[PDB]
Write a structure and sequence with these properties.
Length: 525
């Protein structure tokens, strides 16, 4: 088999990212104005609804990382002050921001969105911003929350109509409603939201001139950093010389980086992104050996070499597998040395076992084709939690974020937690709805149903999973929050990964333009 060349060429190899002077200074003073805004709103209870709105704008503008302490402290104070009993303006916004922060606030706050009759109030539909806030809140629902199932149907139907009716009245607003309807805020990766929210915000009549100025300057600065990371990754990858040293596999470093970029985009996580991108490149290679390429005996040997985890067994390995074993060992050994210096060898060793367990289970399914053992579906979902990378990507984030990982986080990881199982299953379902239709067609076999009904059934199962994942997100406290945030971003990324095709051999225009919007086009002025 042959894979197409990278579509990106050499444009990311060397970065010439070009800055003005004093941009550090302008941004510094903008930062202080924003701190003061947050402080002023927090200090007066009457302004708490406005505080939530400011927090939302900072988050959607993609600059929450500049005000981590201020925002965490603000939301903490909001949670402590009102508990589950918020009853103000911005009730839908309060609900979503609380749950995004990890506070499992209940749906009771919505009860007075409905009549005495239990039908949504007429005044809701005659307020677009409120309708939109309610729609966005529905994305945070867990299973069994009927008031939000109801609210989703209500807002969807009304928002659809309004967006059409407002095309000739306010086109930008139509666009903003229709983007939300296409994918709700919670499901969109935060850096992708920022690229889309920034221009909408900038054109809003009442927008804060200080926030938008800061958001655009910062967007461009952080984009330059991302470009530096991808430049470093591009050089590393080019050194490996994949077309010669792994001609069976793909030239996809930009794609591995984009996936890593989804876990955490913030400047603080630069080292973690670069390492994760390398591990994803290694996974891609290794998968491409286990899927087609390697014979059973070759795979058996490679698996023991991975168990051995030492360059000294390079001689025990099939010739074509040598370069990949070398790249793999060099990559992990560099990280092992970094962690040992920080006194975190135990965290490295915990991570390492997950890497071995990944290859192990790839060898499990190779055994299944060699002895005629048949998958069932218990196993085909279970062993795919591992081989699909859910455990590996999560713990690779642990290694990249060593400063905050606890022994408890690893205990969580090894516990086979529902959240990772759900991620794994959802990933399989999303990929089966475009192709690894050997699935939709097979579902049609199982249930004897037409394509239309099958698609509806399969899509409802996917909606069920997002709700299951929301519940696990709100209930999981044993893993440090910044790692939980990384996990949830990687789960939402699957929706981009498996949008309309398999975007790693092919590449949908949708996926291609997301990459350009993040890495190529800077914000204007």
């Amino acid at each position: 088999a042959n894979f197409s060349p990278s579509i990106w060429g050499d444009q990311f190899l060397i970065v010439d990212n070009q800055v003005e002077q004093g941009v550090e200074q302008i941004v510094k003073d903008l930062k202080k104005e924003v701190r003061q805004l947050l402080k002023e709103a927090l200090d007066i209870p009457m302004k708490h609804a406005n505080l939530l709105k400011l927090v939302d704008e900072i988050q959607r503008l993609g600059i929450s990382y500049l005000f981590e302490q201020e925002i965490d402290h603000a939301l903490q104070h909001i949670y402590e002050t009102y508990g589950d009993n918020w009853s103000g303006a911005r009730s839908s916004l309060w609900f979503r921001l609380m749950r995004k922060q990890g506070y499992f606030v209940t749906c009771d706050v919505f009860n007075n969105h409905k009549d005495e009759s239990g039908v949504f109030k007429q005044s809701l539909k005659n307020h677009v911003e409120g309708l939109l806030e309610l729609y966005e809140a529905t994305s945070m629902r867990v299973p069994g929350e009927i008031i939000l199932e109801d609210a989703l149907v209500f807002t969807q139907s009304h928002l659809s109509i309004i967006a059409k009716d407002t095309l000739s009245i306010n086109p930008a607003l139509s666009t903003e409603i229709q983007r939300a309807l296409k994918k709700p805020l919670w499901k969109r990766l935060p850096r992708i939201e920022a690229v889309q929210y920034i221009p909408f915000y900038e054109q809003q009549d009442s927008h804060n001139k200080t926030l938008i100025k800061l958001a655009k300057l910062e967007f461009n600065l952080l984009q330059s950093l991302h470009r530096e990371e991808l430049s470093q990754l591009s050089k590393w990858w080019k050194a490996f010389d994949v077309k010669n040293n792994a001609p069976y596999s793909r030239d996809r470093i930009v794609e591995c980086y984009f996936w890593a970029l989804a876990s955490r985009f913030e400047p603080q996580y630069s080292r973690a992104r670069i390492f994760l991108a390398k591990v994803i490149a290694l996974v891609t290679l290794i998968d491409d050996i286990y899927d087609a390429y390697g014979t059973y005996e070759e795979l058996k040997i490679f698996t023991e070499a991975i168990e051995r985890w030492s360059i000294t067994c390079l001689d025990m390995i099939p010739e074509y597998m040598k370069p990949i074993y070398k790249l793999f060992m060099d990559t992990y050994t560099e990280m092992e040395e970094i962690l040992a210096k920080e006194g975190k060898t135990n965290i490295f060793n915990c991570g390492k076992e997950f890497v071995k367990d990944f290859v192990r289970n790839l060898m499990v399914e190779a055994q299944w084709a060699n002895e005629g053992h048949i998958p069932t579906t218990e196993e085909l979902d279970s062993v795919a939690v591992i081989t699909g990378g859910a455990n590996l990507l999560t713990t690779t984030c642990y290694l990249g974020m060593s400063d905050i990982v606890t022994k408890e986080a690893f205990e969580w990881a090894v516990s086979e937690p529902p959240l990772l199982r759900y991620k794994g299953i959802l990933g399989r379902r999303l990929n089966d709805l475009a192709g690894h239709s050997s699935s939709v067609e097979s579902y049609m076999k199982e249930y004897n149903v037409s394509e239309e009904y099958a698609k509806n059934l399969l899509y409802k199962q996917v909606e069920d999973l997002w709700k299951d994942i929301n519940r696990e997100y709100l209930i999981t406290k044993t893993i440090p929050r910044p790692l939980l945030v990384a996990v949830i971003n990687l789960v939402h990324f699957l929706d981009v990964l498996y949008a309309a095709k398999d975007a790693f051999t092919a590449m949908g225009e949708e996926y291609k333009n997301l990459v350009k919007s993040l890495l190529v086009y800077p914000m204007s002025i």
